[PDB]
Amino acid sequence: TQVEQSPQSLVVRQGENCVLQCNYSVTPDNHLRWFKQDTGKGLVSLTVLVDQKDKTSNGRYSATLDKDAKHSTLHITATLLDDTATYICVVGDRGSALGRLHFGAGTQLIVIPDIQNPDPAVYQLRDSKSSDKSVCLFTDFDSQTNVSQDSDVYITDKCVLDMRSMDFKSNSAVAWSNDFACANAFNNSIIPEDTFFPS
Amino acid sequence: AAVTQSPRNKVAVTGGKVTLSCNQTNNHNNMYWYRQDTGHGLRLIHYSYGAGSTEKGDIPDGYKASRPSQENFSLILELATPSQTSVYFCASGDEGYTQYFGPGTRLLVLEDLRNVTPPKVSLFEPSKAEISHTQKATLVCLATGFYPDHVELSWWVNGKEVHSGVCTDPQPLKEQPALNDSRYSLSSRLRVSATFWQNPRNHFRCQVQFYGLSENDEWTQDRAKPVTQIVSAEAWGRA
Amino acid sequence: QKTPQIQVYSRHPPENGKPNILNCYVTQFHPPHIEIQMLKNGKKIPKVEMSDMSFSKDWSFYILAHTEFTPTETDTYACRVKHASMAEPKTVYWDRDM
Amino acid sequence: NYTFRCLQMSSFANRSWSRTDSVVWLGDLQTHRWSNDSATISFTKPWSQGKLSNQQWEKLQHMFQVYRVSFTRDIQELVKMMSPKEDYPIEIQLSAGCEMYPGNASESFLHVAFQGKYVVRFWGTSWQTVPGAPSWLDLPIKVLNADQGTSATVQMLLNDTCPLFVRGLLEAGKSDLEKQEKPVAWLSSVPRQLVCHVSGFYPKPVWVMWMRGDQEQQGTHRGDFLPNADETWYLQATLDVEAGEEAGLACRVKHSSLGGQDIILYW
Ligand SMILES: CCCCCCCC(=O)N[C@@H](CO[C@H]1O[C@H](CO)[C@H](O)[C@H](O)[C@H]1O)[C@H](O)[C@H](O)CCCC(=O)NCCCCCCc1ccccc1
Ligand SMILES: *[C@@H]1O[C@H](CO[C@@H]2O[C@@H](C)[C@@H](O)[C@@H](O)[C@@H]2O)[C@@H](O[C@@H]2O[C@H](CO)[C@@H](O)[C@H](O)[C@H]2NC(C)=O)[C@H](O)[C@H]1NC(C)=O
Ligand SMILES: *[C@@H]1O[C@H](CO)[C@@H](O[C@@H]2O[C@H](CO)[C@@H](O)[C@H](O)[C@H]2NC(C)=O)[C@H](O)[C@H]1NC(C)=O
Ligand SMILES: CCCCCCCCCCCCCCCC(=O)O
Ligand SMILES: *[C@@H]1O[C@H](CO)[C@@H](O)[C@H](O)[C@H]1NC(C)=O
C-alpha cells in the first residue's frame, strides 16, 4: 500500500466543515485525484492536483497538494446529507497512458442531517392487496433518537429521506411481524415522550 | 467520454464461467479492469493497449482478459471462486493519463445455488392519521423472503422513476439471523404530499430487481427456477 | 548487427623484461553485449581492467581492456572476443613490431 | 570549443531483464559514470560536480534516479503497446548534452537510437521522429508528448541546466582540460612496412611523418587515434619501402606539448 488515507471514517453534523488527508509514497507522483463514491455507485471525480504546491476548488470542495511532503488534504465546507459517501485518493505515476493509478482505501464520511421541526409518531400502514397485513412506521423523530432491533419481529435501522421540492427531511424506521401491534412495536427503543400514537 | 459495463450485477456458482463486459465508443485505445474490495483501494487485474492486446495487471490470477475490438474489453472468469466476489470497474483512456471509469459490476460467487429465491413484494398504503397530522403521505414497500441479498429497489410514479422523498434501508436484514443461509427482507419509504397521494390518477409502483440464476444455470429442485427477474407491487392514489 | 574490430598495442615502448601496459581496444560493434579476454600464452589473464562502455557518433560501441604485463622473448599475448556477430571467438595476437 | 555528452545505453533482453548504463564526456575526458549496479551517479574527476552546490547536485541526481526507473518501465510499456510490431531484444541509446561556443552561446541536443539507428529527438518543446524513422513510432511520440511534466523538465535541462552546468565544469576542470602530455615514439618493421609508434600525448591534435632529411614521404598512412587507459592517446604511421632504403629514413613527430622541439627518430 503506497497510498494511505486518514481518518478511516468520521461522523459530522450538517453544516460542519471537515478535513480529509491523503499520504503517499508513490514515485514519481504526477498528479493526485480525489473521487467521491456514494454507496453502491461509482467514481465521481472531484478535483485533480498537478503542481508541486497546488490548490484547487470545486464548489464546497477545496484541496491542496504538497509533493515534497507527499500529502494532500481535501476540505469539504458546510456539509450536506448528500456528502455522505466514501472519499478516495488516487495518485497517477505518469502524465500519460503509461501511468499506473495507485488507489487509497478511502475515507467514509457520514453527515447527520439537521431535523428542524420534529413531530415523532408511530403510524400503522395496511397492505394495498391484503388489508389484514400491516407495518408500523416510526417517523419524524430528530437525530437524538436511536432505533434498536423477539426474533419474529423485524425492525429496520433508521433512514433519512429528502423531499427536495419542499426543503424537508425526515427520519423513519419500519417494524412488522405476525399478538403484535404498533403501540408495542418500538418498546425496546428510547423514543421521545411526546410521540403521537393515533386512534 | 462514457463507458458502460454489463451485466451490472451477477450471482454465480463456484466452478462456473462468468464474463464481465465493458463497452466504450470514445475510440480510446486503452482499457483497464479493476476490482474493489473493502479495506483496499482499486487494484488492477488486466489492461489493454488496443484490439488483440491483453496485458497482466497487479492481480491477474484467476482471470483472463479479451479485447476483440476497440470498443469491447471483457474479463473472463473460467472457474469462478468465492474470492472473486467483488465490485469490478472498467475504464478507458487515450494517450493522456485520465481514465474514464464505468459504473461498476457487482459479482457474488456462491458455493452453491440451492437457497437462491426471489422476493415477494408488498406495498403498504399511507396512514390516514399521517395525512391529517402532517399533510404528508408515506408509502412503504417491503421485499421479503429473498436470497442472496443482490436486489435493486426502485420507486415509479406513472411510469417514471422517482428519487425525491425516497429512502431505502442501506442493507437487507436477515429474517432468521441464527441460520447461515437466512433469507432477507428489505424496506423502503416513498413520502409525498397528501394531495399527490389523494389524486387517483397517480399510479405508484415499488419495483425490486432480483439477481439470481441465468437461463443456462442447472436447476434440480421441484420449485420454480429462481431466475433473475423483477417483482413489483402497485397501488393508485385515492381521496 | 556489426562485427567488432580489435586492436592490441602497448602503452610504453616494449623492452623485454620491463613492466608495461597492454591495451586491447574493441570498436565498431553492435549489440553492446560482448565478452573480452586478454590472454597470456592462451590462458586468461586474471587482473584485467575495463573502461566503461561508450559509443561513437555512428552509434557503434567501443570499450578498452588493459592489463599490466612484462614482455619477454618467449611469451605471447592476445585479445579474445566473443560477440553474437561472429560464429567463433576472434583472437588477435599482440605483435611487438606491428 | 567543447562538447558535453551524456551517453546512455540500455539493453532489454526480454519482458523482465534489462540494464541501463551511462558515461559522461566533456570533450574526450570522462566526467561521470553511472553503472546499472549503482544507485548513484559517480564522479570520475575531482571537479565533476562543477560549480553546483551539494543541494543542486543532490536534486539533479534524484531526478536522474527517478528517470532511470521510470524510463525502464516506459520502454517495457511502449513495447506492449506496439506488439506485435516490435519484439525483444531491444537496444536503446540516448546521446544528450550541449555544445559550448564562446561568449554565452550554446546549442543542446537529445538524440535517441533504436536498434542502432537514430530515430527520435527532442526539439523545441516536443519529441519528434527524424527522417527515415518508421511510422509505427508516431504512437510512442504521441504518448511521450502527452506527458507535459516530462516536456517541461526536458526543456529546462536542455535550455538552461546543461549550459549553466557545463560553464561551471569548464571553469572547475580547467587544469585537466588544458593539460599537456608529451608523446614518446618508437620504431619497428614487418613484411617492408615500417611503423612509427606514438604514445602518451594529450591533447589529440598531433602530426606524424616519415622523412628523408627534409623530404616528407607522401606514402605515410596514419592510423586511427586509439586511447590509452591513463587518458592519453596513441597513434601510429606506417610506410611502404623496399628492403635497402631503411637508412636515412626518420619519423618526425610534432605536438603542442614539445614546445617546438620535435621528436626525430632515425632508423
Ligand atoms: C535525458 C532525458 C531526461 C528526462 C528526464 C525527464 C523527467 C522524467 O524522469 N520523466 C519520466 C518520469 O515522468 C513522470 O515523473 C515526473 C515527476 O518526476 C513528472 O511528473 C512526469 O510528468 C511524469 O510522467 C517519464 O517516465 C519519461 O517518459 C521517462 C523516459 C523519457 C525518455 O527517455 N524518452 C525518450 C526515449 C523513448 C523513445 C523510445 C522509442 C521506442 C518506442 C517503443 C519501443 C522501443 C523504443
Ligand atoms: C527551450 O528552448 C527551445 C529552443 O529551441 C531548440 O530546442 C531546445 C530544446 C534546444 O535543443 C535548443 O538548443 C534549441 O534552440 C524553445 O522552443 C520554442 O518554443 C516556442 C514557444 O514556447 C515555439 O513556438 C518554438 O517554435 C520553439 N522552437 C523550436 C525550434 O521548435 C522552448 O520553448 C524553450 N523552453 C523553455 C522552457 O525555455
Ligand atoms: C539493473 O538495475 C535494476 C534496478 O536496480 C535492477 O532491477 C532490480 O532487480 C532486483 C533483483 O533482480 C529486483 O528485486 C528489483 O525489483 C529491481 N528493481 C527495479 C527498480 O526494477 C536490474 O536487475 C539490474 N539489471 C541487471 C542485469 O543487473
Ligand atoms: C541528460 C540531459 C542533458 C543535461 C544534463 C546536465 C546536467 C549534468 C548531469 C551529469 C550527470 C549525468 C547523468 C546521466 C544521465 C543518464 O542516465 O543519461
Ligand atoms: C531474459 O534474458 C536474460 C539475459 O539474456 C536471460 O538470462 C533470462 O533467462 C531471460 N528470461 C526469460 C524468461 O527468457
XYZ file of N, CA and C in Angstrom, chain A residues 30-31 33 35 37 39-43 48 50 86 88 94-106 119-121 123-129 133-135 137 139-140 151-152 154-166 168-174 176 196 198-199, chain B residues 8 30 32 34 36 39-44 47 49 56-58 89 94-99 101-103 106 122-127 129-130 133-134 136 138-140 142 144 163-171 173-177 185-193 234-235 238:
414
model
N 2.857 12.232 -10.418
C 2.482 13.196 -11.458
C 1.295 14.037 -11.028
N 0.274 13.382 -10.497
C -0.937 14.075 -10.131
C -1.697 13.261 -9.105
N -5.757 12.711 -7.595
C -7.169 12.935 -7.851
C -7.976 12.501 -6.651
N -11.793 11.290 -5.635
C -13.061 10.773 -6.097
C -14.060 10.791 -4.943
N -17.416 8.527 -3.960
C -18.194 7.336 -4.249
C -19.340 7.168 -3.240
N -22.734 5.103 -1.891
C -22.912 3.677 -1.616
C -23.524 2.971 -2.830
N -22.920 1.849 -3.210
C -23.355 1.098 -4.374
C -23.163 1.749 -5.739
N -22.546 2.933 -5.797
C -22.423 3.692 -7.035
C -20.953 3.689 -7.494
N -20.622 4.602 -8.400
C -19.305 4.678 -8.979
C -18.554 5.932 -8.607
N -17.521 6.210 -9.388
C -16.477 7.133 -9.018
C -16.698 8.445 -9.722
N -8.462 17.338 -9.467
C -7.155 16.760 -9.719
C -6.109 17.844 -9.505
N -2.008 18.885 -9.845
C -0.907 18.555 -10.744
C 0.467 19.166 -10.374
N -17.996 7.632 0.422
C -16.592 7.293 0.627
C -15.783 8.205 -0.289
N -12.073 8.981 -1.971
C -10.945 8.157 -2.395
C -9.864 9.024 -3.026
N 2.425 8.831 -13.879
C 2.868 9.446 -15.149
C 1.834 10.418 -15.656
N 2.309 11.396 -16.416
C 1.461 12.337 -17.109
C 0.954 11.840 -18.458
N 0.806 10.520 -18.618
C 0.302 9.901 -19.838
C -0.287 8.516 -19.535
N -0.775 7.852 -20.585
C -1.344 6.493 -20.510
C -0.363 5.415 -20.047
N 0.928 5.735 -20.048
C 1.945 4.855 -19.486
C 1.892 4.741 -17.954
N 1.118 5.615 -17.310
C 0.975 5.610 -15.857
C 0.100 4.512 -15.282
N 0.416 4.164 -14.040
C -0.409 3.331 -13.181
C -1.052 4.223 -12.122
N -2.280 3.883 -11.744
C -3.004 4.598 -10.703
C -2.881 3.806 -9.414
N -2.615 4.520 -8.331
C -2.425 3.918 -7.022
C -3.529 4.462 -6.141
N -4.444 3.585 -5.737
C -5.670 3.975 -5.049
C -5.536 3.784 -3.552
N -5.940 4.793 -2.787
C -6.151 4.648 -1.359
C -7.431 3.869 -1.101
N -7.536 3.323 0.108
C -8.707 2.545 0.523
C -9.918 3.387 0.979
N -9.796 4.709 1.000
C -10.953 5.576 1.167
C -11.209 6.022 2.596
N -41.593 15.799 14.935
C -43.017 15.529 15.119
C -43.203 14.013 15.269
N -42.473 13.393 16.216
C -42.392 11.929 16.292
C -43.745 11.217 16.418
N -43.946 10.192 15.591
C -45.206 9.459 15.549
C -44.974 8.029 15.128
N -47.214 5.378 13.011
C -48.406 5.131 12.192
C -48.481 3.668 11.773
N -49.699 3.195 11.534
C -49.929 1.850 11.032
C -50.358 1.964 9.566
N -49.711 1.182 8.696
C -49.980 1.192 7.247
C -50.433 -0.196 6.797
N -51.457 -0.253 5.950
C -52.038 -1.528 5.508
C -51.616 -1.875 4.082
N -51.404 -3.170 3.833
C -51.054 -3.713 2.513
C -52.192 -3.433 1.530
N -51.848 -2.854 0.377
C -52.833 -2.466 -0.648
C -53.675 -3.621 -1.219
N -53.143 -4.843 -1.158
C -53.818 -6.058 -1.634
C -54.452 -6.893 -0.516
N -52.856 -7.577 6.597
C -51.398 -7.400 6.794
C -51.037 -5.901 6.942
N -50.122 -5.580 7.860
C -49.709 -4.182 8.093
C -48.248 -4.032 8.537
N -47.763 -2.794 8.529
C -46.442 -2.452 9.072
C -46.592 -1.235 9.986
N -44.758 2.359 11.032
C -43.812 3.377 10.621
C -43.575 4.341 11.779
N -41.747 7.596 12.585
C -41.236 8.668 11.712
C -41.193 10.047 12.380
N -40.508 10.981 11.730
C -40.466 12.401 12.118
C -39.733 12.725 13.442
N -37.446 -12.535 17.967
C -36.799 -12.705 16.652
C -37.790 -12.885 15.492
N -39.088 -12.973 15.803
C -40.165 -12.951 14.794
C -40.765 -11.546 14.574
N -39.538 -7.788 13.176
C -38.469 -7.159 12.388
C -38.551 -5.654 12.516
N -37.405 -5.029 12.762
C -37.304 -3.586 12.862
C -36.104 -3.164 12.030
N -36.311 -2.239 11.098
C -35.209 -1.753 10.266
C -34.433 -0.688 11.023
N -33.229 -0.415 10.541
C -32.430 0.697 11.019
C -33.080 1.977 10.480
N -32.748 3.117 11.081
C -33.295 4.385 10.636
C -32.735 4.793 9.278
N -33.432 5.719 8.637
C -33.148 6.104 7.269
C -33.751 7.485 7.012
N -32.983 8.378 6.391
C -33.423 9.753 6.154
C -33.801 9.983 4.688
N -34.989 10.547 4.471
C -35.481 10.875 3.138
C -35.523 12.382 2.994
N -35.470 12.841 1.754
C -35.328 14.251 1.447
C -36.345 14.590 0.363
N -37.426 15.264 0.783
C -38.443 15.776 -0.128
C -37.906 17.091 -0.690
N -37.156 16.980 -1.784
C -36.316 18.081 -2.280
C -37.070 19.382 -2.607
N -38.236 19.276 -3.247
C -39.023 20.462 -3.641
C -39.561 21.273 -2.454
N -39.785 20.616 -1.318
C -40.259 21.278 -0.091
C -39.150 21.658 0.912
N -37.439 19.618 2.843
C -37.923 18.896 4.020
C -37.253 17.535 4.127
N -36.723 17.220 5.307
C -36.104 15.925 5.579
C -36.781 15.229 6.759
N -36.811 13.903 6.736
C -37.386 13.128 7.838
C -36.773 11.746 7.948
N -36.587 11.333 9.195
C -36.109 10.013 9.535
C -37.307 9.104 9.674
N -37.099 7.822 9.445
C -38.109 6.837 9.784
C -37.491 5.472 10.009
N -38.243 4.599 10.662
C -37.922 3.179 10.698
C -39.225 2.417 10.603
N -39.111 1.155 10.212
C -40.264 0.324 9.903
C -40.182 -0.907 10.784
N -42.453 -4.757 11.550
C -43.550 -5.672 11.207
C -43.363 -7.067 11.821
N -46.593 10.693 19.093
C -48.009 10.585 18.754
C -48.363 9.138 18.397
N -51.860 7.469 17.244
C -53.272 7.790 16.930
C -54.306 6.672 17.200
N -55.590 7.016 17.042
C -56.729 6.074 17.090
C -56.883 5.365 18.429
N -24.612 -5.540 -14.801
C -24.360 -4.606 -13.706
C -24.302 -5.310 -12.363
N -7.013 2.448 -25.061
C -6.569 1.824 -23.812
C -7.727 1.543 -22.879
N -8.904 -0.837 -19.118
C -8.318 -1.303 -17.850
C -9.411 -1.931 -17.015
N -10.351 -3.300 -13.060
C -10.015 -3.288 -11.641
C -11.068 -4.038 -10.818
N -12.592 -3.792 -6.656
C -12.626 -3.014 -5.417
C -13.198 -3.908 -4.340
N -11.542 -2.228 2.432
C -10.209 -2.181 3.050
C -9.055 -2.082 2.064
N -9.363 -2.085 0.758
C -8.368 -1.933 -0.301
C -8.803 -0.833 -1.254
N -7.826 -0.160 -1.846
C -8.078 0.674 -2.998
C -8.318 -0.225 -4.208
N -8.852 0.354 -5.283
C -8.976 -0.386 -6.552
C -7.655 -1.022 -6.936
N -7.694 -2.285 -7.372
C -6.484 -2.997 -7.806
C -6.613 -3.455 -9.256
N -5.563 -3.211 -10.036
C -5.540 -3.517 -11.467
C -5.384 -5.018 -11.735
N -5.154 -5.096 -18.343
C -5.379 -3.926 -19.157
C -5.073 -4.241 -20.620
N -3.878 -2.281 -24.598
C -3.474 -1.126 -25.396
C -4.127 -1.099 -26.799
N -1.186 -8.394 -18.376
C -1.371 -8.667 -16.956
C -1.194 -7.409 -16.107
N -2.115 -7.214 -15.169
C -2.020 -6.158 -14.173
C -1.289 -6.629 -12.926
N -1.700 -6.113 -11.772
C -1.103 -6.475 -10.479
C -1.617 -7.798 -9.913
N -14.590 -2.717 -11.865
C -14.638 -1.464 -12.601
C -13.750 -1.530 -13.812
N -7.363 7.597 -23.759
C -6.456 7.744 -24.884
C -5.012 7.861 -24.352
N -4.153 8.595 -25.060
C -2.755 8.741 -24.686
C -2.544 9.532 -23.382
N -3.529 10.339 -22.990
C -3.467 11.079 -21.717
C -3.635 10.190 -20.490
N -3.325 10.733 -19.318
C -3.413 9.966 -18.069
C -4.829 9.692 -17.530
N -5.834 10.441 -17.989
C -7.186 10.307 -17.416
C -7.759 8.959 -17.793
N -8.324 8.272 -16.805
C -9.035 7.032 -17.022
C -10.480 7.333 -16.737
N -13.961 5.984 -15.960
C -14.467 4.752 -15.329
C -15.937 4.429 -15.632
N -16.220 3.136 -15.798
C -17.580 2.631 -15.893
C -18.264 2.622 -14.535
N -19.564 2.258 -14.504
C -20.372 2.330 -13.278
C -20.146 1.187 -12.291
N -21.258 -5.628 -9.845
C -21.225 -6.406 -8.614
C -21.332 -7.888 -8.906
N -44.622 -6.304 -1.325
C -45.894 -5.761 -0.877
C -45.723 -4.270 -0.694
N -46.744 -3.523 -1.105
C -46.790 -2.074 -0.970
C -47.857 -1.723 0.059
N -47.464 -0.949 1.070
C -48.329 -0.561 2.166
C -48.722 0.899 2.001
N -50.028 1.149 2.047
C -50.590 2.463 1.768
C -50.458 3.404 2.965
N -50.359 4.714 2.702
C -50.222 5.725 3.749
C -51.357 5.760 4.772
N -50.980 5.971 6.028
C -51.915 6.160 7.142
C -52.746 7.435 6.967
N -54.171 8.850 9.448
C -53.654 9.621 10.586
C -52.427 10.474 10.222
N -51.497 9.905 9.448
C -50.328 10.651 8.990
C -50.755 11.806 8.093
N -52.380 14.513 10.304
C -51.396 15.089 11.236
C -50.284 15.934 10.575
N -49.813 15.532 9.389
C -48.684 16.206 8.707
C -48.972 16.822 7.336
N -48.765 14.954 4.812
C -47.863 14.129 4.012
C -48.345 12.684 4.029
N -46.830 8.713 3.475
C -45.661 7.834 3.343
C -46.122 6.460 2.918
N -45.678 6.024 1.737
C -45.870 4.664 1.255
C -44.687 3.832 1.737
N -44.931 2.569 2.076
C -43.848 1.672 2.450
C -43.883 0.430 1.566
N -42.045 -3.412 0.994
C -41.417 -4.480 1.734
C -41.131 -5.590 0.750
N -39.562 -9.309 0.722
C -39.335 -10.352 1.711
C -39.007 -11.694 1.076
N -36.846 9.705 -7.168
C -35.782 9.670 -6.142
C -36.043 10.615 -4.985
N -36.598 11.789 -5.274
C -37.025 12.707 -4.224
C -38.035 12.026 -3.309
N -37.837 12.204 -2.005
C -38.743 11.702 -0.997
C -38.583 10.230 -0.711
N -37.488 9.627 -1.178
C -37.262 8.195 -1.055
C -36.123 7.942 -0.094
N -36.242 6.880 0.689
C -35.056 6.297 1.274
C -35.246 4.807 1.522
N -34.216 4.053 1.186
C -34.236 2.607 1.232
C -33.174 2.172 2.238
N -33.505 1.183 3.072
C -32.550 0.633 4.051
C -31.184 0.424 3.370
N -30.068 0.830 4.026
C -28.736 0.640 3.412
C -28.412 -0.815 3.083
N -28.913 -1.736 3.903
C -28.730 -3.170 3.676
C -29.972 -3.970 4.081
N -32.083 -6.848 5.977
C -31.978 -7.531 7.260
C -32.256 -9.028 7.084
N -31.588 -9.853 7.892
C -31.804 -11.299 7.888
C -33.106 -11.672 8.593
N -33.876 -12.566 7.982
C -35.174 -12.984 8.528
C -35.032 -14.016 9.641
N -33.997 -14.856 9.526
C -33.586 -15.822 10.555
C -32.093 -15.576 10.875
N -31.771 -14.557 11.702
C -30.355 -14.190 11.921
C -29.435 -15.316 12.428
N -35.031 -9.631 4.126
C -36.061 -8.633 3.892
C -35.422 -7.268 3.672
N -36.138 -6.394 2.971
C -35.680 -5.036 2.703
C -36.899 -4.138 2.662
N -36.781 -2.942 3.236
C -37.875 -1.983 3.199
C -37.429 -0.651 2.626
N -38.398 0.096 2.120
C -38.147 1.412 1.568
C -39.369 2.271 1.798
N -39.153 3.580 1.889
C -40.237 4.537 2.024
C -40.230 5.494 0.845
N -41.429 5.856 0.392
C -41.634 6.963 -0.522
C -42.663 7.878 0.129
N -42.261 9.120 0.402
C -43.123 10.089 1.047
C -43.430 11.205 0.088
N -44.713 11.498 -0.048
C -45.215 12.515 -0.964
C -46.205 13.392 -0.184
N -46.606 14.515 -0.775
C -47.656 15.367 -0.191
C -48.997 14.641 -0.218
N -48.019 -2.508 -6.617
C -48.536 -1.220 -7.047
C -49.808 -0.843 -6.326
N -50.150 0.440 -6.410
C -51.402 0.982 -5.893
C -51.666 2.360 -6.493
N -55.904 7.744 -3.828
C -57.356 7.820 -3.531
C -57.673 8.937 -2.547
